[PDB]
Ligand binder design. Structure first.
Ligand SMILES: [Cl-]
Ligand SMILES: [Cl-]
Ligand SMILES: [Cl-]
Ligand SMILES: [Cl-]
Ligand SMILES: [Cl-]
Ligand SMILES: [Cl-]
Ligand SMILES: [Cl-]
Ligand SMILES: [Cl-]
Ligand SMILES: [Cl-]
Ligand code: NA
Lengths: 77, 76
């Protein structure tokens, strides 16, 4: 009954059964279609997203919340 | 397409950063009752599955939904 065993069970429910991460990512891109119109904008978003995911302040945030943070950081430049 | 960008972003979040696996491990390290008691862990998984069905939870992380499940067990 370890943290590892419980992480495996809970992550499989969230990610493999519910597929929450993929659902959230699709929601974000449906709400922000500029990222499908400009390869350059998507590259910029993926750079900001990879930076957000390095931050300990972002460690417990969802893909939706971190994509949205990446988008907002692009807008605030 | 939105599906292509979604797939790439999810691949970065899931497999490059391991964010969900790290969040689940963080949660369990912070809530040792669930490693000490198999009964508590089974109740948490029951509640967690219920939280994940709620539209209000659709954009929340695995950490935030495990916390919400935990708080529901404490509120009963
Ligand atoms: Cl998946
Ligand atoms: Cl997966
Ligand atoms: Cl997923
Ligand atoms: Cl370029
Ligand atoms: Cl994931
Ligand atoms: Cl995934
Ligand atoms: Cl995962
Ligand atoms: Cl508590
Ligand atoms: Cl509390
Ligand atoms: Na643009």
């Amino acid at each position: 009954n370890s943290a590892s065993k419980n992480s495996a069970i809970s992550s499989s429910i969230f990610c493999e059964k519910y597929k929450q991460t993929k659902e959230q990512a699709l929601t974000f891109f449906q709400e922000h279609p500029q990222y499908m119109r400009s390869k350059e904008d998507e590259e910029q978003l993926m750079t900001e997203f990879k930076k957000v995911l390095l931050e300990p302040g972002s460690k417990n945030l969802s893909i939706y919340q971190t994509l949205l943070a990446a988008h907002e950081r692009l807008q605030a430049l």
